[PDB]
Design a binder for these strands. Structure first.
Lengths: 128, 128
DNA sequence: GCGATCGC
DNA sequence: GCGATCGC
DNA sequence: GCGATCGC
DNA sequence: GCGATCGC
DNA sequence: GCGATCGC
DNA sequence: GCGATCGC
């Protein structure tokens, strides 16, 4: 299921992921959407890996993460969340598509993707 | 001056480049001819590369060279010749075109391509 | 069964 | 790309 | 991620 | 040569 | 300069 | 894929 990525993203402050635990979480940063716009991805995993790689290459974004977390994002790994936002062994930050694929939701549509904590993700799926 | 590969090639024994220092040297192995037949080449420089890389991929042939030589062939570089067959900084085997493009010589016609030693290529360009 | 990340 | 994991 | 394989 | 992509 | 290979 | 070198 390949395809290209599209989207405008939103502007973000000094606490990007700060609300990744409420509602639909945090959005794709504008600067990041540009680096990835019109690009081409194999699978969604391919996207996730690149997204986090791009995050670690953005000076103002990488400044909000712990040294180890930055080392993680540099090789496609997702940053770890605060203790209170994990869910058992699920402790990384996850990407979520607002509208599923079954509802014609764009899989590589950055405006349809946001960053949420595992804890929140489980609620979002339960309906809360 | 790009082009496509072509030619039949001739069957080579176990001592392929054992006469590369006489006459016109060893011919382009049939097996290599087949594996290379009709291929997009940007320059003869590129063909040399792909050629030797194809020589290292052919078990029967790669067997005739030391490890240092296969390392080279693996990256498109030709095997170094014995010391008595080199000349100056030229220590590796060189591809020889029997006919120039002027005389309708195949620039990518394996049948018009052979492998000769530096000390021999020099004796061919002076008059046998 | 299902979304979603991990590691080669 | 593939095989495996995790919580529901 | 690590070994192939582009691309200049 | 070697950094940068592909293809598992 | 010519026919080739080297060195990124 | 481009310059740069090689020996004559």
């Amino acid at each position: 299921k390949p395809g290209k990525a599209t989207g405008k993203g939103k502007p973000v402050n000094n606490k990007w992921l700060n609300n990744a635990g409420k509602d639909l979480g945090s959005p794709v940063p504008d600067r990041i959407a540009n680096k990835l716009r019109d690009k081409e991805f194999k699978s969604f995993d391919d996207f996730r890996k690149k997204f986090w790689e791009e995050v670690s290459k953005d000076p103002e974004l990488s400044k909000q993460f712990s040294r180890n977390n930055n080392d993680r994002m540099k090789v496609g790994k997702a940053p770890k969340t605060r203790t209170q936002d994990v869910s058992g062994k699920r402790t990384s930050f996850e990407l979520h598509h607002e509208k599923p694929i079954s509802q014609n939701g764009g899989v590589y549509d950055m405006d349809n993707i946001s960053v949420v904590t595992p804890k929140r993700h489980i609620d979002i799926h339960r309906g809360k």
